[PDB]
């Protein structure tokens, strides 16, 4: 079975008389009833609850200073508000992007999580040797990072047990990065994904994000997708406990050229890579900002009928 899901917020175009019925009627894409954003096929929760984050530190900033009970209470209300049907049977996507639960992977723009972790240990234990400080910072961050992510996922699964739940973008790969220029995932990240059974055995579906970059060759764009889909399939077949579905998150815009629609050549080669590798389908995502006016709705509909729809159909 191969299932393609509509996760583009075309509900914003309904006020203009554009209901996007062709998604399911012509292109065979699974679509929520009445083209609702959240429905029986799929529902994404954007930054649900009150995950500790650095924005100002929200709920502690780093997970080891966070209030878990506060987060879980808010998360419960957000889930119930957005997914009122207890019997929701679709793909439930938790979109939590503040930090990675692996200390080492909080690089570049996520570096402040590493720094704050160490600062807190140093302040509390000024006379601990540096190795002890570093070790403690990593340990505490990973311990509470795991607690927040695993407890939230457990709560979602308990409250909505008929759905298949997962976190957006995990597992990570970091291919075509400086440090890792080839299309293969970073080796240390592969090892860290292998030891993250607490997350992957609990998830029902793996959702690697495979958004293309414009500043890459055509072959490199396929490689970006391929490396990420292979990482998710390895982990999906890994898992001791179960057989996970793999549904890559796919965007019709370039991640580094956000106003530019994917070319037909790119749609064809990358959607072919996803299917050829044996994924269980894919999820087409869109940003609200790209279809929040009638003219944006009509331009997106033109792209859907000109290129995206046809490519997805076959």
UniProtKB/Swiss-Prot annotation:
Residues of the active site: 97 (proton donor)
A Gene Ontology BP annotation from the UniProt entry: carbohydrate metabolic process
Disulfide bond residue pairs: 13-297, 173-185
Gene Ontology MF, one: hyalurononglucosaminidase activity
Keyword Heme recorded: no
Glycosylation sites: 67, 215
The record's account of how the chain is modified after translation: N-glycosylated. Glycans found include a majority of small oligosaccharides (Man1-3GlcNAc2), most of which are either alpha 1,3-monofucosylated or alpha 1,3-(alpha 1,6-)difucosylated at the innermost GlcNAc residue, approximately 5% of high-mannose type structures, and 8% contains the terminal trisaccharide GalNAc beta 1-4[Fuc alpha 1-3]GlcNAc beta 1-in beta 1,2-linkage to the core alpha 1,3-mannosyl residue.
Reported tissue expression: Expressed in the venom glands of worker bees. It is also detected in the testes of drones but not in the queen-bee venom glands or in pupae.
Reaction(s) this enzyme catalyzes, per UniProt: Random hydrolysis of (1->4)-linkages between N-acetyl-beta-D-glucosamine and D-glucuronate residues in hyaluronate
Coiled coil, from the record: none
Enzyme Commission numbers on file: 3.2.1.35
Location relative to the cell: Secreted
Cellular component aspect of the GO annotation: extracellular region
UniProt keyword list: Allergen, Disulfide bond, Glycoprotein, Glycosidase, Hydrolase, Secreted, Signal, Zymogen
Function of the protein: Hydrolyzes high molecular weight hyaluronic acid to produce small oligosaccharides.
Description of how the protein assembles with itself and partners: Homotetramer.
Similarity section: Belongs to the glycosyl hydrolase 56 family.
UniProt protein name: Hyaluronidase
Source organism per UniProt: Apis mellifera (Honeybee)
Portion of the full-length sequence here: 42 to 362 of 382
